Amino acid sequence: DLGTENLYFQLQPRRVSFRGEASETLQSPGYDPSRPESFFQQSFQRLSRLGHGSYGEVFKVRSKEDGRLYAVKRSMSPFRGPKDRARKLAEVGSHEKVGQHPCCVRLEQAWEEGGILYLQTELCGPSLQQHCEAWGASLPEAQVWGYLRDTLLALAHLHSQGLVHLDVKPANIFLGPRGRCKLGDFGLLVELGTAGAGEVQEGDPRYMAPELLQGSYGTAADVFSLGLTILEVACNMELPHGGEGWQQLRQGYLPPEFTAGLSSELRSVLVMMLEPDPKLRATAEALLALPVLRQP
């Protein structure tokens, strides 16, 4: 409990890494620590703002180190204090607990400076959300199957290690070349059975597994969230944040006016993923064993 520890009320960048990686000093072509500009300002070309919110901002950048494109998430304002700092840095630890996997967004490096946290990842293609916005309609099933398979591979990787993502949604699944995708955004990720029993942040209510209302955390939660993610993109169906419709989607209801055009096979898989009872809900590994989800 950092809130009662003597850690309160206390200029150069410091690498953030939990996996262990001395040194903690940063260097780059274009960077002179005696100049007042931040490491981020000096060491990257800032090309565009990919996203923003209460957390801060995500930029498309070009690295002066290697000339390659990356995404960098920069927190909004200096750490509020020790708990805030620990919570934000925990994202780097999580992203590292996941480690390298072809269906997970890769973290290149992370650092803090002036109370600001910076996470540099590979630059991916558009999020599934962006892609569906651009399509302006339901996605063809041939695309959907590939996205379902790849995100299930990512989840099987997390879940085998007792990690739960807790915010699977169209906005943090990113398209790559020829129909592949990657899961990102490990800021809410939890390792089951690691204190505190609480401390848990809540994902987007539209995709939240019903058992989380009772505080019942487990890997099954992500399967449900991916189920609704795929339902949304396959049907161009806006998901309720609450009310009767929110309840219905968590009672096995598939709205006919949105879902009647699904193949029987995709409908059958979604029903397995959207099972209200997490004890009965299919696991990612079990789904990937189905012949319909075999390597195409």
Instruction: Cite the active site residues.
Output: 167
Q: Which is nearer to ligand DB8, 38 or 121 (CB)?
A: 121
Judge if the upstream peptide bond of residue 20 is cis by omega within 30 degrees of 0. Answer: no
| Residue of the chain from 125, 218, 240, 276 that contacts ligand DB8 (CB under 6 A) | 125
113 binds ligand DB8 (CB under 6 A): no
Rounded CA gap, 58 and 46, in Å?
Answer: 10
75 binds ligand DB8 (CB under 6 A): no
Region near ligand DB8 per CB under 6 A, out of 4-12, 121-129, 145-153, 224-232: 121-129
Region near ligand DB8 per CB under 6 A, out of 39-47, 68-76, 80-88, 238-246: 68-76
Region near ligand DB8 per CB under 6 A, out of 23-31, 81-89, 115-123, 274-282: 115-123
Q: How many chain residues are in contact with ligand DB8, going by CB under 6 A? A: 19
Residue 77 annotated in ligand binding: no
92 binds ligand DB8 (CB under 6 A): no
Binding site for ligand DB8 (CB under 6 A): 50-51, 58, 71-73, 105, 119, 121, 123-127, 130, 172, 174, 184-185
